Amino acid sequence: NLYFGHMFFLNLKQINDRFNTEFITKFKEILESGWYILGKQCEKFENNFAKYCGVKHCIGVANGLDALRLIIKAYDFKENDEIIVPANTYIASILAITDNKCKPILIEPDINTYNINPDLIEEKITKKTKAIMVVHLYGQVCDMEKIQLLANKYNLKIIEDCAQAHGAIYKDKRVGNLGDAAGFSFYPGKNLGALGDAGCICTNDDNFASKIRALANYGSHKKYENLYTGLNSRLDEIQAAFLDIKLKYLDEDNNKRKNIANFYLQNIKNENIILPSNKFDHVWHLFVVKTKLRDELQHYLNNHDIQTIIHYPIPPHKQKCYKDLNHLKLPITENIHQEVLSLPISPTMKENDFKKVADILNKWKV
Amino acid sequence: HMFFLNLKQINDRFNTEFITKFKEILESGWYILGKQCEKFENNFAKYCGVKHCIGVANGLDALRLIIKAYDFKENDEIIVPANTYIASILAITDNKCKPILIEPDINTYNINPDLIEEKITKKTKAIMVVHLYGQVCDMEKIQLLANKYNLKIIEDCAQAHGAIYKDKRVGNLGDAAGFSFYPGKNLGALGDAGCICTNDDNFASKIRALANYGSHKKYENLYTGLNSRLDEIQAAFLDIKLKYLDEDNNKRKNIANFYLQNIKNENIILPSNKFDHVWHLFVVKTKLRDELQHYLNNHDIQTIIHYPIPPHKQKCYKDLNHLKLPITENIHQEVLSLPISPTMKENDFKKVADILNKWKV
Numbered sequence: 105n106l107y108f109g110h111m112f113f114l115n116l117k118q119i120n121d122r123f124n125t126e127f128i129t130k131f132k133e134i135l136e137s138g139w140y141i142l143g144k145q146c147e148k149f150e151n152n153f154a155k156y157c158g159v160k161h162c163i164g165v166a167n168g169l170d171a172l173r174l175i176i177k178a179y180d181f182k183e184n185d186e187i188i189v190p191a192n193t194y195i196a197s198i199l200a201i202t203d204n205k206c207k208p209i210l211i212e213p214d215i216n217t218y219n220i221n222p223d224l225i226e227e228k229i230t231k232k233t234k235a236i237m238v239v240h241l242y243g244q245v246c247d248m249e250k251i252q253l254l255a256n257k258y259n260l261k262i263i264e265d266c267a268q269a270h271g272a273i274y275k276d277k278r279v280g281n282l283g284d285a286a287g288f289s290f291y292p293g294k295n296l297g298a299l300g301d302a303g304c305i306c307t308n309d310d311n312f313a314s315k316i317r318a319l320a321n322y323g324s325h326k327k328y329e330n331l332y333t334g335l336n337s338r339l340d341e342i343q344a345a346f347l348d349i350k351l352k353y354l355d356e357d358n359n360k361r362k363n364i365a366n367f368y369l370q371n372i373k374n375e376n377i378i379l380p381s382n383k384f385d386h387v388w389h390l391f392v393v394k395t396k397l398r399d400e401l402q403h404y405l406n407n408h409d410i411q412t413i414i415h416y417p418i419p420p421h422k423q424k425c426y427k428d429l430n431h432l433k434l435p436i437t438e439n440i441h442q443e444v445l446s447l448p449i450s451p452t453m454k455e456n457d458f459k460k461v462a463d464i465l466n467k468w469k470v
Numbered sequence: 471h472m473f474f475l476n477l478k479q480i481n482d483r484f485n486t487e488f489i490t491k492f493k494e495i496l497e498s499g500w501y502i503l504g505k506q507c508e509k510f511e512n513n514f515a516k517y518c519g520v521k522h523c524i525g526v527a528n529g530l531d532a533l534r535l536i537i538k539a540y541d542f543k544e545n546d547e548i549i550v551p552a553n554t555y556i557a558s559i560l561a562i563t564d565n566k567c568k569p570i571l572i573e574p575d576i577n578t579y580n581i582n583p584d585l586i587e588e589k590i591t592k593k594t595k596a597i598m599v600v601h602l603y604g605q606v607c608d609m610e611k612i613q614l615l616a617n618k619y620n621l622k623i624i625e626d627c628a629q630a631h632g633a634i635y636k637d638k639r640v641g642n643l644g645d646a647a648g649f650s651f652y653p654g655k656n657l658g659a660l661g662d663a664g665c666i667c668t669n670d671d672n673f674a675s676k677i678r679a680l681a682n683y684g685s686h687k688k689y690e691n692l693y694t695g696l697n698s699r700l701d702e703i704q705a706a707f708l709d710i711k712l713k714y715l716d717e718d719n720n721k722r723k724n725i726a727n728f729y730l731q732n733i734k735n736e737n738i739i740l741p742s743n744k745f746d747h748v749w750h751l752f753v754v755k756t757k758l759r760d761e762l763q764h765y766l767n768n769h770d771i772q773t774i775i776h777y778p779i780p781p782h783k784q785k786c787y788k789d790l791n792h793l794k795l796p797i798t799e800n801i802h803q804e805v806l807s808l809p810i811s812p813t814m815k816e817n818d819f820k821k822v823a824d825i826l827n828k829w830k831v
């Protein structure tokens with residue numbers, strides 16, 4: 105104990121320490137190969153992640169923002185084409201739209217799911233709408249049925265932002281296989297997290313998959329040639345290998361998260377706290393509580409040596425980078441942003457720690 | 471087979487240190503924007519003689535972010551060499567700027583500075599200089615024009631790590647500079663990697679934000695940015711290798727000298743080094759280029775072309791395909807690169823020179 109009592113929001117050392125021997129073995133394998141980019145590890149991980157999601161194709165890319173940006177670029181929509189998207193998602197969802205010179209059309213979530221309210225989408229469809237981007241926020245899959253029907257009615261693409269929901273299931277399909285194309289983040293904090301920036305795109309469409317590979321490789325499908333004006337967005341061999349190791353435990357890990365979320369849901373009882381009771385399958389990337397006393401709560405937990413993070417306190421429309429959206433009246437989204445706080449959760453989290461989080465919350469008088 | 475660029479041989483020198491640092495990073499529990507990135511950035515900045523180094527995700531991203539940060543208007547013009555790698559041009563068009571393509575000097579393979587001014591217009595906002603194949607571009611006139619015309623100078627340093635011009639390094643010859651650390655570059659990562667260098671405090675801070683979703687501070691986005699970061703692991707691997715970069719570049723100098731002193735074949739035009747050349751690519755030029763590549767291949771010598779189709783002739787740039795750039799076009803029809811690397815063995819480079827001398831067409 106001679107190397108150098110605070111409960112960290114997400115202890116990645118502890119999550120990853122289980123795999124250190126394997127990571128090192130695979131690193132040395134890569135060194136032996138002399139190949140660090142677009143190699144056998146990327147191919148292997150792609151194949152395995154496609155199988156996991158139930159899709160035909162997976163393309164490793166540099167991060168989850170790029171994965172969304174690439175999808176939208178591949179569709180080659182006109183300037184100011186409209187993409188419907190939840191108002192309360194992480195900003196990178198919206199950045200991917202505006203970077204492609206599309207107009208985001210911000211929809212309120214359901215207060216009881218934190219995910220886009222499907223019943224509010226149709227009224228905002230216009231002749232410029234080209235896609236709906238669903239986000240499975242915090243880990244909970246969106247109620248996809250009406251959204252799929254609407255996409256079909258209006259000949260819209262469905263783009264899934266799966267950054268927070270790796271392996272969740274709606275009816276008979278995995279997230280990643282509920283629309284036309286899907287972006288994932290494997291940022292280290294995610295349920296399946298790399299040791300660096302990393303992402304993917306999933307799809308069943310052969311042409312789309314091919315076009316994405318070229319677009320993510322300078323626009324080059326063949327050495328020396330550039331069919332498209334592309335970008336550089338690749339998944340390193342090293343990261344692909346690390347992800348493949350962890351992917352073998354991802355269902356087991358997510359079910360362990362479910363066990364801890366269900367402990368919180370059943371054991372936390374405080375009139376000042378609204379618990380995130382799930383309406384659909386939830387893999388609990390984030391365990392988000394809601395209170396009118398949010399900053400007080402975070403200070404209270406900190407005083408009791410529990411670290412928390414807010415996801416999120418400023419919604420995209422109120423950010424300085426989007427002053428042209430600051431006017432929008434989105435009171436549900438705004439309320440959420442004032443009131444949410446995330447509690448520590450992870451698949452390797454200690455019983456004494458989750459028991460403390462619950463007990464400390466129960467004791468909170470505000 | 472003799473490989474064009476044997477990266478296993480180059481990187482095997484550092485395996486024990488790479489493994490140590492990887493394990494240190496595991497011990498840290500921090501993989502993004504941590505101590506390794508800071509350390510490498512600080513050392514690379516010192517290496518280039520600049521105030522600020524921002525690790526980013528790759529070379530293309532480096533150039534894209536520099537241009538994004540300047541907030542140019544759609545169709546603003548950026549003067550750039552026509553014969554550079556296509557990613558220099560992709561950075562420009564990604565920002566909805568217009569690449570104004572200038573012929574190189576056949577004696578440097580770099581932008582001909584005497585051909586820049588005639589192409590400057592009210593829309594010109596920048597010159598992108600590229601230090602192609604390892605050789606620094608002649609900046610004197612470029613600096614004068616930038617001053618006269620209120621242009622930014624952006625350096626694409628992806629092929630010329632460490633090259634020197636007068637009292638300065640590439641990276642410190644303009645307003646801001648992009649670097650690739652793709653594994654094949656003179657300083658190569660074990661993955662995709664890049665940086666931006668600059669002396670301007672405000673610009674540097676803006677670039678940091680822009681490469682981090684546009685966020686300077688947790689929770690807040692000042693700008694509509696990208697996610698373009700240099701991983702801790704890659705920063706570590708680069709910082710190990712950086713200590714040997716000048717030495718590695720001198721090793722390439724030695725091989726290039728051997729080629730220059732020993733290849734004697736009337737069918738082959740050899741490269742010169744008017745200004746400092748770190749010899750990322752050793753580029754020969756012949757009317758029988760495909761023939762030569764095939765011949766070398768029959769002799770178990772792998773080569774690559776840099777490059778056979780110029781940016782303006784690419785299908786992605788249809789609207790440029792009509793542009794008449796005969797110097798650039800002729801170069802693309804005639805160049806081939808010979809194997810060169812800091813670790814390349816004597817017997818291997820002697821064979822390349824000998825087989826080239828035997829090419830009797």
Ligand SMILES: Cc1ncc(COP(=O)(O)O)c(/C=N/[C@@H]2[C@@H](O)[C@@H](OP(=O)(O)OP(=O)(O)OC[C@H]3O[C@@H](n4cc(C)c(=O)[nH]c4=O)C[C@@H]3O)O[C@H](C)[C@H]2O)c1O
Pocket residue numbers: 112113114115116117167168169170193194196197239265267268288289290291292293302303413415499500501502697
């Ligand atoms: C819906 C949606 N769409 C697109 C995206 C874009 O994907 P991306 O481009 O891959 O980021 C996201 C990203 N989403 C996340 C976003 O939710 C937010 O996550 P966060 O929990 O606030 O992030 P964090 O604080 O950096 O890390 C969480 C915890 O993990 C610990 N940690 C972290 C790191 C990096 C480490 O090395 N060591 C650690 O111990 C520290 C913290 O306790 O910001 C991230 C940078 C984004 O990737 C998204 O949610």
Ligand SMILES: Cc1ncc(COP(=O)(O)O)c(/C=N/[C@@H]2[C@@H](O)[C@@H](OP(=O)(O)OP(=O)(O)OC[C@H]3O[C@@H](n4cc(C)c(=O)[nH]c4=O)C[C@@H]3O)O[C@H](C)[C@H]2O)c1O
Pocket residue numbers: 138139140141336473474475476477478528529530531554555557558600626628629649650651652653654663664774776
């Ligand atoms: C002027 C300028 N500006 C911007 C850029 C953009 O930088 P980037 O976004 O960081 O790529 C470049 C990149 N420029 C290079 C470009 O010159 C070209 O380089 P190349 O020599 O044709 O590339 P390569 O064939 O992939 O590798 C060279 C040799 O190295 C071996 N190798 C390679 C890898 C990756 C490996 O893992 N193991 C190996 O053994 C195989 C080959 O024999 O293509 C690259 C993808 C670009 O990064 C440029 O030159």
Ligand SMILES: [Cl-]
Pocket residue numbers: 768
């Ligand atoms: Cl022969």
Ligand code: NA
Pocket residue numbers: 166300301302338340527661662699701
């Ligand atoms: Na990367």
